[PDB]
């Protein structure tokens, strides 16, 4: 492979040129995964494939950075945990962009023709990025919870410390764990956003949009499972404890 | 008003300077709507206010452009309708950014303190942008539907024509109405996205995140009402007619 | 209930009508600034105005948050200053989205016709939002620099501590000042981004693209001034110190 | 099931295991390109690699869609070409998000340490994605220009018809070529955007910010070359023709 074409003018996609850019990145191995253009069953199949691969790359990186967050949290390196969660959120937002590409540009008619030939078994439930992100979420939450325990703080404390008008006592440690909580909440909101945009996409490709009233019922229910349910519970606590 | 301050160094927000930039835009009238800083009950109130105003400005512009789309559709100016829907989508994406600003940076504790003093009657159900966008959606859909009728096309036709591999007959008119449908679908997906991001925001401020299992039940149901339900019905039709 | 348009098919109206949602937001004042439809030179005039207004609301709010950041830095409330800079950054990203709206949807031919009917002397150099943002950048930088001095820290020390591999000394205060630094650099990068997208927009409307070899030469040179030039200087010193 | 990491607490593993979802996507091949954890110089190396890989997947897909656009333009399938350019634009926006990820989260100090352990001759000038995109821009522009000729149209005619106020002649083919033009200009603006954000990123890592008065001078001059310089020339001619 020096190219994924054979006929052309300047239309040839030249790659595998031995540059150290390609060597450092292992770009030829990555480009090797694309369905060769001699085996595409549809002009839109590549687009379908590439958006999945971009997502899976972002999700494996999210996993990696969450493992680092656990290390930082277990060693009280709270400022360094913050950066890991912020980076994970940025990567999650790429997966959102990627599924919205399908919503905006994948023709339902192409998808139905393609799907009418799939192994009728290819389900995103088997996605490694998704399964592993779900697994690592429990250790991640445990590490944050124990850090809050060791500091002698309650979740209501770190939540309240985000408000400049809140007058209770603070330390450098409690405000750092506040920043961590806020960054974890933003990551979780971004993953929930992915689930909601993936839903909108599915309604536009397989039907089932609920305003009118293919295992859509389980999908709609799974689409509201948070990464960190304890953060959302704490939000609900604050409403009941502080509201009027 | 030459300023929204009184004490300062270079910290003064100088405005109302008579420039023709300000005159053309009526910027002094717009800046006049901000709660004066002598009457703010909380440092986060301005942020709350400004994100609403940005949204309402985008929604009134969406309304304006949809009225233009109706004109173009009623006169068979399909290429010009496309641009109106594309512009409306871009504006809708601003409202999404704006509600995600609250999710990411509005402290729940500030909101609860602020809300603990609101007229306990200020509901987004009274939003002019939202109500008027809901009203105009029916005329908008009617105008598109009649245009498809006059051309002698079915919705399944315009949907199928988005796929390059589809072999049925096309005209310039049918592919133009295909582009219009696609742009309308993207607008509707963006408004559904707003409703979903507004939901995530509310779960993070008032609780009620459904994975754990304040009129949240009606909100969750209204959050799946589409602007153009007939487009989503047609997506469901295509699944049943073309799938295996 | 008022009305931004008069002779219509009734379902194509917009309304302004005294609810508490509108009262709390001063919404009727804000919508009052829109150019009346009885007075529009061109159908694209509303769009032109609204993207400016959205931008100006974002910039006035940026200023308000930078003032709060100055207050936090002067009192050594470093964690609280971080949140202010991050909020400013997200507001800045709304201005980027607003100017790209014009790049993507404002027809050059409507801009040229509108520029003829428009006061020849109206210029964005008179933006209150842009002008006050440049004025407030000086005290913001001073407050950060003073806070770093009081802590007895080196700006190069602050930069190095963002790296997990860095082995030198860390306190809680130095790592907090590190997070402030990074948040400040993200804000400045966002504003540079605005300047760059505004340039791309001007090239597509008034011509002047530099690769082809009306106050353009100043605009390009102005487009490279940072809000916090010292942070970019500090980035240059670190390269000579560690990358040669 | 394989594993991108070995000695762990079991819930912190990543897996690769033969489902049809993985088979259809060639996912195991694609994840194989990630640098093994046993071989990473620095914890920020994975992040560095993944943002490049995501970018390169996006660019190879852009190329594939531009090839399709050439095919559509050569056969006068103008509506179909529009969809290809819009898809390319959204893919380009993923590359922008990917490089801003480095601007916002890659520590300069890790980049300098990593740049030392890295082959001194590796350069983005050898990007297959970037290189093929520049090569394919020439036939893309030719196909568009030829299509406009065959229609007997003026590029200024095509520009004017984007305006709803324009009164001159319009056919279905001229307005289709107008939509193609606008989609092409949005793509080029997106790529200019990438170049500008890449510059901002380089300034924050290698120094070199131009407002402070290592192949920087070429990079800045390269950052202003468009993919379709004729469209920007055409924008300049329209200003002299109509804005003086
Ligand atoms: C970037 C593209 C996509 C990615 C990364 C992706 C990923 C996923 C993931 C992770 C799940 C498990 C979701 C959960 O448990 O909440 C899932 C399920 C599902 N996906 Fe997607 N998906 C993509 C595109 C699509 C498309 C284009 C369709 C159909 C047109 C689709 C249809 C479904 C359905 C019906 C389910 C649930 C039932 C089932 O597993 O078959 N997905 N997908
Ligand atoms: C940019 C900011 C916001 C905008 C433009 C906005 C707008 C709206 C709109 C249009 C509705 C009607 C929704 C529907 O029928 O589906 C609504 C309802 C609602 N909003 Fe939001 N909202 C904003 C922020 C908030 C915040 C910060 C909260 C609470 C923390 C909130 C709580 C609610 C609730 C509970 C409802 C439904 C029940 C009710 O009307 O009280 N909103 N809002
Ligand atoms: C959409 C909202 C817009 C905003 C908020 C805005 C704001 C600004 C600002 C703040 C400046 C000063 C730049 C600096 O000093 O670095 C400026 C200058 C300039 N703007 Fe924009 N602008 C907008 C749209 C436009 C449009 C549509 C044009 C169309 C030609 C334009 C053309 C120019 C030019 C040529 C300058 C350079 C100085 C001058 O000739 O007045 N701007 N604008
Ligand atoms: C994140 C993904 C990145 C991609 C996809 C990428 C791609 C590229 C491309 C395509 C060029 C050629 C530009 C042109 O010819 O106009 C280039 C040049 C360059 N890149 Fe980036 N780049 C990335 C990250 C970085 C980073 C982190 C640095 C850090 C210093 C960097 C530094 C440079 C420099 C200095 C040049 C100019 C020529 C040279 O010295 O090699 N790039 N890069
Ligand atoms: C689950 C979904 C699918 C989602 N992502 C996929 C990737 C490769 C193959 C198939 C898929 C599949 N098209 C479905 O309709 O269920
Ligand atoms: C409906 C929501 C509200 C939403 N947007 C608002 C604007 C101004 C005043 C109040 C609101 C309100 N805070 C609530 O909790 O119901
Ligand atoms: C500076 C620019 C302008 C930019 N923003 C504006 C707002 C209102 C009136 C004019 C403007 C103006 N159109 C120009 O061509 O110089
Ligand atoms: C050109 C740039 C580089 C940019 N992208 C890369 C990918 C792999 C290795 C190196 C690079 C490189 N770091 C440099 O400083 O020149």
Numbering used by the authors:
A (entry chain B), B (entry chain B), C (entry chain A), D (entry chain A): 4 to 216, 235 to 265
Give the original sentences from the paper that presented this experimental model.
pmcMarE is a bacterial enzyme that catalyzes a unique 2-oxindole production reaction through monooxygenation of (2S,3S)-β-methyl-l-tryptophan (β-Me-l-Trp). However, MarE diverges functionally by catalyzing only a single monooxygenation reaction on a tryptophan metabolite, terminating the oxidation process before full dioxygenation.
MarE Δ(270–284) was crystallized in the presence of 10 mM β-Me-l-Trp but without the inclusion of sodium cyanide. Unlike the successful crystallization of the full-length protein in the ternary complex, we resolved an ES crystal structure of truncated MarE Δ(270–284) at 2.45 Å resolution through co-crystallization with β-Me-l-Trp. The dimer-of-dimer structure was constructed through crystallographic symmetry operations, consistent with MarE's homotetrameric oligomeric state in solution. Each monomer structure is nearly identical to the ternary cyano complex, with an RMSD of 0.54 Å for 243 Cα atoms, though it features a longer disordered region spanning residues 217 to 234. The other (conformation B) is a new orientation where the substrate's amino nitrogen points away from the heme center, while the methyl group points toward it (substrate with cyan carbons).
